[PDB]
Structures are given as structure tokens and as C-alpha cells.
Amino acid sequence: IETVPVKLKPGMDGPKVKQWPLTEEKIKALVEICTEMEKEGKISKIGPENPYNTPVFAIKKKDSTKWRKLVDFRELNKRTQDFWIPHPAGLKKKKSVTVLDVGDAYFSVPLDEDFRKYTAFTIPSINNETPGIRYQYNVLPQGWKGSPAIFQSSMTKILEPFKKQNPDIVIYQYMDDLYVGSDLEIGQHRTKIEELRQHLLRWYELHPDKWTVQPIVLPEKDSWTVNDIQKLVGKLNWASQIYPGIKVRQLSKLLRGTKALTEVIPLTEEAELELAENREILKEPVHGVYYDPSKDLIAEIQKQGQGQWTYQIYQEPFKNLKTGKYARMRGAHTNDVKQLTEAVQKITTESIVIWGKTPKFKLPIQKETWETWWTEYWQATWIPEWEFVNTPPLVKLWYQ
Amino acid sequence: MVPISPIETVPVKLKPGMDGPKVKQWPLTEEKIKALVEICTEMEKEGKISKIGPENPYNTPVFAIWRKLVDFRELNKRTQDFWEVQLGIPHPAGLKKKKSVTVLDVGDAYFSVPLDEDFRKYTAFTIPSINNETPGIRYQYNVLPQGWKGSPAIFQSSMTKILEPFAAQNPDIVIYQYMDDLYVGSDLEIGQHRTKIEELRQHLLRWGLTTPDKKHQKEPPFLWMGYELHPDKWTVQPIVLPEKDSWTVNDIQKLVGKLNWASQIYPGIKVRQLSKLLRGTKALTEVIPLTEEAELELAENREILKEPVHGVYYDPSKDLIAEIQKQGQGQWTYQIYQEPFKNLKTGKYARMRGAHTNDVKQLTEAVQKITTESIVIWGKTPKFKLPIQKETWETWWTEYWQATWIPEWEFVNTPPLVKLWYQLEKEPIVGAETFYVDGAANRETKLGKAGYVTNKGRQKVVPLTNTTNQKTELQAIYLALQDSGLEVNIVTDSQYALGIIQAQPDKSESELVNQIIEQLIKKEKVYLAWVPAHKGIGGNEQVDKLV
Ligand SMILES: Cc1c(Oc2ccccc2OCCn2ccc(=O)[nH]c2=O)cc(N(C)C(=O)CF)c2ccc(C#N)cc12
């Protein structure tokens, strides 16, 4: 009911990002949505004196037939002043966590006057026929980093009774999402979630406990071919960058001679001992692996085929903070890009739960394909940063 | 007098920290001064400008050619940024056929849009007096000046706000605004159309804006931005390829301009060689001889540009189709249409700069480009007709290490067909010979060696001059492919060679890589295995090639 002064970082102008082209149905959806919001005062039309712009598009969330408006506030977010809570390290340790969309509440708090001009967006026209419908926000916009920071006091006031009632439930907030972690039963968790949503009304099943870090495993065979031993030596040589005491000379001793790749080679005793020592070394965690809140998180994804994808989250090379394997199949059996987009969304969610920020992705896809199609399968309210790797990494099969 | 509705002004500021312009007035001849005094007296009588005292410290030079021309370049430098009047120009293929299209001249509305009063003081200008024996006449603008930075954007936004209720209450017509001209189309009967045109003239007159009762000068075919717009079709303005005995650089840039511009409706235009002659020149007057490939290409262009070809307008009730053909040397051509033989538009796509490539990647890129262009122009993705078998694409994207996707498409049997030229095995081949390859070079003398040893005792080492490590590694693999049967296992330690071959190219800048490709095409089964170097892996003989 009272505006809080918001400004930009010193020396930085507002965002001026080109609006990318949209299909006719998304344009119509944005026209309806923005017409309704204008009737509700949440947005207002602007004139040509506003040169700032932020891209906008439309999506359809899970289990819904209504269009939703998504605003790519990335540039404005990195250009918005830093607002100033330690991350709940117990949220990832909880048995279950539920994600709630609390974005509507932001629309009840007005936005600072002089700052509104920086939230300008454009509904584009087909074939550049009309100049495009320009709007700016009058309330807290969903997707902007200042919206959860400004609403933090009100959110604390609304959640104070529920927090005082259940001290065993962990509550976290990130952008327009509220993460509620507990250890109850799925039915008790769903009834509790309905209790919290009706508690918030009058004012996504996720299980981190079923997630762990994945170690480097070696094959267990009774007969080894020349090729099997060569791949084993390659994988152990790669692992020696991560683990110090990895030793391969006794196994490479077996590859002496020019033998056919499919020829079975029996392991000497020294080779078995070396392999066993290497297994024992790989059973231990990596030495000196810590998280640094001042550094970026990097997430790499490899396409393993058959709907299987591997990923690693790290900050320094060979110092993995998280590793995982997303093989879920949800209506994307014939579309690589949809699978990759869902994978990026899940990894970003896990990164939000663990560290409270999004990572920078290295996507195994051409820039033009990704930038052409990723908005068709996006369902999250946030958007991470990403880059594109064009050379096939050798380590792919070493994560398979 | 009928009360005229006022046009809401746009608040305009200068750039932060900057001040208004203060430029010295150009000295003018007596006749020019008299002409500007007459013109500015008439304009002041009309209300476009107003006299100001000496308190105004700003000044902008004025000229006459009469016709008054104010040079606002400095004030433009000091004026705030505005939202772009047009993010892009429309494309004719996106337009929708109309029974009637009328053109209204709203040029008189340009000087009728008021300027923000707090900003008018920055538009001050001085008319020099005769012999400079009196103070020059001081004026300032009360409306949007022609040449000022924000005049087109403010004018277009004001006109849009004025036209909004009329367009809303008349959905059965279409109104477009381009510069000082309105364009009103409809499928109504011609009488109803002229009626609603009169209604628009009245609605605009309710803001004091006058549209000429005179018959407008623009009439079919409309010539606009190098386009010809007809009642039922569109095309490009006539493209004439000149007959030149010798071609300079500007002649080749004008020819590639005419060919690039003509490629949007004339199918099959190629610009590879003619633009290749302009590679790394940076000299406008340099005369460059014409290669034979540029001669054949230019002759094919003259054969395609023989007779006029037209495009149709968009019918949203029909499906949108885009068909692609490969032309070789990284050239691709495509047609976008809804009915056979009748194109909406055409175009081409040239491969990006790269060391290695294959046809499937280039086709994918072309499809992405066509998708983006179609969404721009028509707001939807077209259904594709591609020269590639379904099984080929399935094998490619299922086995490719990157994520890839093309939208809904069907196979069309129009050679040359995009195909996979070789496929590496996933597992070692039983019964096939195993070639352990290696190569090495000296960094100073550039002397190297490449070779292999096999499980059957076959061996070879070849010495090489003026080579690198990477080159000798590729050369080793090439030797293994040369001297092996139809099925072969190859073991290398070159992460470089494996990085090249796992990218699956069918063409390369390096002739050695192309030779390797030609060898792989001839094989039945090839398994390529990698091992770490210098790890004592026998068979992998680093010492045999470092001698
Ligand atoms: C005639 C015209 C435009 O045409 C139409 C105006 C209104 C409705 C539909 C229309 O086109 C349908 C197709 N069509 C086309 C021609 C025809 O004769 N009959 C037809 O049915 C559109 C334009 N552009 C690109 C704009 O941006 C206008 F703001 C023009 C730009 C410059 C000039 C000139 N000099 C003429 C333009």
C-alpha cells in the first residue's frame, strides 16, 4: 500500500532487449491476458518516450488449458540493484518438498513510480504491420528479482501463523515460487499443502531424499576383451584427474602387444589388485569439494540416447558439487529439444533447492535450434543463463 | 467553429546530464533571408512556430533551398532515445488480399501534432537580419519539426491513438499507417468501402486533421521499397542484370545486391561465386577477374531472371508449406507457398563459416531460418517438404550427440537427396583387422611420421615433411583406412581426430579430412576406438613414429 524506492545499479541504463517473434496464438493469448491486467490496473499503456523493453512470451503450465504470460526479466534482473537471508541448508535434507506459485500476491503491492518505466514490454505484431502494444507494470511483476525482496515482509507476516504452528516444516522462497519441505506422508503432505494454500488464499511432488550424488563405477566382468580393458584404462585415466591415487600401469601392462580388439585377455593378479584399489579409491568422496557463494554454478548436460541425459553441477573443473541422470519420459519421446528443456528446468529446480540460485548451463545443442524452440516447452517462471558447446566431449560415455 | 479535440502531447526529455543545442547560425544571402522571413511569417500565422525573446539561450541553424530546412543534428545528438517507430518493414507475402484498398494523405497532420511545451525551447532558431544590422528573428517550434529525432515516433503513436477507436468499432476493415499515408483495405462492396472511407475522414477531422478531397496520386501498381504491389499479386521491381565487359567491385556488389534482392521471389538464385570474388578485398574501385564458376552461375541467373515471376498474397485459411532443395557448395534454396505452382515467396540459405560440415546440419539450419522467417511474416510454422528420407533423419538425430529437431515435415523425392554417407560402429567388429595408428611431428623442423601396426603383423611408417602432430594423427588414420579391408577396427590416441570424426562431416576445408571421408564412404564397417597416449598401451607405438 506504500511504494518502496527502487533504483538501478550506478552507471547502468534500463534494459533495451529486442522482442523476438511470436506465433499468432501466443500473440492473441497475450492480448487477452494484458487486456484483463489493464482492466485490473496491474499494467498501463505507454507512449514512445519509453525506450526500454523486455521480451515477453506465453506458455501453458502443467495440468492447465489456460495461457500464462512469461516475461524474460534476465537483463533487468542483472541490471537491478542488489537487494538485501541465508539459504536453508535443511531444505535439501528434507524428505519431500512442494512448489507453489505465489506470483499473484505480488500484484497486490504497487511498484515504485520512477522505476515502472524499466518494466516496459511489447506485444509484437505479425509481419511488423502495427508498432506493437506497449505496456509497463504498475505493481510488482512476476519474474523480477525485486518482487520477492519487496514482498518479503508481507510474506513473513502471512506465513507467521503457519510457521509458528509447524516448526518442523521448512519454508523457502525463490522468485514466484514457494518451496515447502517436510517429512510427512504423501497424503498428509497433500492435505497440509491444501491447508497452506487455503491459508494463503484468505490473505508438484518433489523428493530430495530420493536424490544422491553418483559415484564413478567400473565394470565387473569375468572375461575382459582388449576393447573392454582399453575403455577401462581410458575411464580410469579420466578419473585420475579427480582422484589422486588412481593407478593404471598394471592394467595397461595387459595391452602390451598388437592384439585384436575382440580378443579376451585374462587379468594378471597385479591387474586385479590395481583394479580393486581403484574401486576402493572411487568409493570415497572427492577431496576438497566446497561451495563458494561468490562464484557461478556451471551445469553440463550430455545426451546419452534413448531419452537418457546426464548432468553435472560444479564450480571448478573436476570438483563436482552434484551429478545426476535424468531419464524421465513425459510426452517427449520423439523430440530431443523438449527433453533437453525439461532437463534444464529440473536441474535448475534442484539447484534452487540446494544453493538458492540458478546455474549457467552448457547445452549440447546448436544456438539456432535452441533459440528457435526452447520457449515452446518452457513451463517455469524463471529463466537461467546458457551457452552452447559445439565440439563433442569425450567424457560423455564416461558418465554413462 | 466546431471544437477541435486536442492531441495529447508526449513528454520529451534530453539525454541525462546534457544540455540543449547552441550552434552558431549560418550567414545567409539577402534573398534567402527574405524567403525565410516570408515562410516563417506564414508558419507563425498558421501556428507551427512562435516568436521568442532573448532569454532563450539555445539556437539551431536554419537553411533554405524557397524551402526552409532546419539542421537538427545537434539536438538529435542531445535528444533522448525513443521507441522505434518500426521494428521492421512488412513483407508483401504476409499481406492479405483485399477487394478495395484506399490511400489517404495525412501529410497535413504532421505539423498539427503539438510538441511538449517544456521541450519547445530546445528547438529555437534564428533568422539572420539583413546586413546583420538588427537582431535576427527568434522562433521556436510548437509542433513536431521535420528532421527532429522524435517526430516519426510521436507522430505514429499519436495517429495510432487517434485511429484506435475507429479501427475497434469497424473490425470489417483494415487500417495501416506508413509515414504520412494511411492505407484502408476491406472486402466490402465498393460503395460501403467509400462510405467507411468518408467516415474515417470525418473521424480524423474531429481532431482538426484534413485529408485531401483530391484524388490521391498513389494507385496500382504500388511501387514501394523495391516492391510492386498489385491487386492480386506482388513481385520485386524489375531486376536487370547489366552486360559488362569487365566487372569492378561495385558492379559485383550491385549484382549481388540485385540477386539477393531478387532471390525472395525468383527461385534458384545463387550468389556463392560472385560474393566469393569479394572475399577480403575492401577496395571499392578494384577490378577483379571473373572465374568460370561465376560465369556459369551468372548465366543461370540470367536464365532465371529472364521473364517476370510474381508471388501471391497470404490466405490464412490454407496451409503453409515450405519446400527445400540442395544446390551444392553449401547453397540451399526454398519456396514458401500454399497452392502448388503459386509461391508466396522464395529464398536461399548459405552454410555458415566452418572447418567441417555435413548436409544434414545445413538442412537443419535452413529449416530453423525458414521457421523464424515464417513466424515473422505469417505468425506460424509451415509444414516442410525436405529432400531427405524419414529413416535417414531418424538415424541421424537418434545417433547424433547433440540435441536436434525439425518441425512437422514430409519427404519429397527431389534429388540431390541428403543422406548419411558413413556410420561408425558402436562395438568392435569381430573378424576385422585391428589397426593401431599413431603419428608425431617435430615442432621445429616440421618433420613427422605416420603409421600403424596391426594384429596380423601388418605395419607401415611413412615419413612426412612440413607437418604437425594433428596432421600426422589424421594421416595415420588415413593410412589405416587405405590398407584395410571393408571392415576394420582403428585404435588412435588423438582426441583431435576423434573430435573431428565424431562430428560426422561429409565435407571439410582440409583435403586430408576429405580423403578420410572418401575412405570411410567405401568401407562397410568402421569402429574407431580411442586410448590415452603414453600410458604403455601396447600396440599403440608412439616410439615407432618418433624416430
Ligand atoms: C497498398 C499498400 C499496402 O496494402 C494494403 C493496405 C491496407 C490493407 C491491405 C493492404 O494489402 C493487402 C494486399 N494488397 C496489396 C495491394 C493491392 O492493391 N491489393 C491488396 O489486396 C500496404 C503497404 N504497407 C506495406 C504498409 O505498411 C502500409 F502501412 C503499402 C506501403 C506503401 C505503398 C505505396 N506506395 C502501398 C502499400
Curated annotation (Swiss-Prot), chain A:
Changing residue 377 to L: No effect on RT p66/p51 heterodimerization. It comes from the Viruses. Changing residue 178 to V: 22% loss of DNA-directed DNA polymerase activity. No loss of RNA-directed DNA polymerase activity. Changing residue 61 to Q: Strong decrease in RT binding affinity for all dNTP substrates and in catalytic efficiency. 100-fold decreased sensitivity to ddNTP inhibitors. Changing residue 177 to E: Drastically reduced incorporation of phosphorothioate nucleotide. Loss of pyrophosphorolysis (reverse of the polymerase reaction). No effect on RNase H activity. Residues 40-206 form the Reverse transcriptase domain. Changing residue 101 to A: 5- to 12-fold decrease in affinity for dTTP substrates. Strongly decreased RNA-directed and DNA-directed DNA polymerase activities. No effect on RNase H activity. Loss of pyrophosphorolysis (reverse of the polymerase reaction). Changing residue 144 to F: 10% loss of DNA-directed DNA polymerase activity. 22% loss of RNA-directed DNA polymerase activity. Changing residue 158 to D: 16% loss of DNA-directed DNA polymerase activity. 24% loss of RNA-directed DNA polymerase activity. Mg(2+) 1 binds at residues 101, 176-177. Changing residue 70 to V: No loss of polymerase activity. No loss of RNase H activity. Changing residue 238 to T: Complete loss of polymerase activity. 87% loss of RNase H activity. Changing residue 207 to A: Complete loss of RNA-dependent DNA polymerase activity. Complete loss of RNA 5'-end and 3'-end cleavages. A motif (Tryptophan repeat motif) lies at residues 370-386. Changing residue 163 to R: In strain: Isolate PV22. Changing residue 374 to L: No effect on RT p66/p51 heterodimerization. The record marks 373, 386 as: Essential for RT p66/p51 heterodimerization. Changing residue 178 to A: 76% loss of DNA-directed DNA polymerase activity. 60% loss of RNA-directed DNA polymerase activity. This is p51 RT. The gene is gag-pol. The chain holds residues 604 to 1027 of 1447 of the full protein.
